[PDB]
């Protein structure tokens, strides 16, 4: 599994 990214970069 992955992760929906939140925040910069």
């Amino acid at each position: 599994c992955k992760r929906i990214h939140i925040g910069p970069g």
Partner: antibody
Amino acid sequence: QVQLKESGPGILQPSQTLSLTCSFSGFSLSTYGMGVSWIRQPSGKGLEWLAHIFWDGDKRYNPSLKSRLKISKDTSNNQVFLKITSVDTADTATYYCVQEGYIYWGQGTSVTVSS
Amino acid sequence: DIVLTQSPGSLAVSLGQRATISCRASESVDDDGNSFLHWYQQKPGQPPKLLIYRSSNLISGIPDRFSGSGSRTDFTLTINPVEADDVATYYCQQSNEDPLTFGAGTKLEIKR
């Protein structure tokens, strides 16, 4: 810097199927770590996440909404689409598409499900 | 689902004073270390605006008056001093586990 923009059916009879299209600029969806979300806001009510697609083709669905949703991409055309099936009236809302990172949000389009 | 509960639901505050908002999660939203709780400001008409990410990190360009604290299940957002254009609704969001949830929103209203 980046643009996101939605396209909606405007009005829908109950129990049709909602098409939504998210047009973007600023990033191809083939870039590793790319992906686009669709978040839904009711009228003057909170936010609800609906679905998310990632660059590598894996889809994510709100599991209480997983039934009626389907996300997809036309990656060489900067498009993410959403189909929400069997539109109940408690589905009138505003659809935002958001690029990964959640900083960059598109204005959002209204759908009202009124017979 | 991880359910996020925000209090206060409504906040009357005067300008230049301190205002605290709170978000608590049904479970840990942490790896262990960094947490996956973020804070969005939504002005009427606009999209939510991300302010703070991973509990404590200010997004570039947001005023330093905005801070975030907390870990595991209890998180808090502080605006100090409240300037008249923070009269908005604030939401917290978790991104530890899908589905991605947001809280009910706290709205800041000026007192007079």
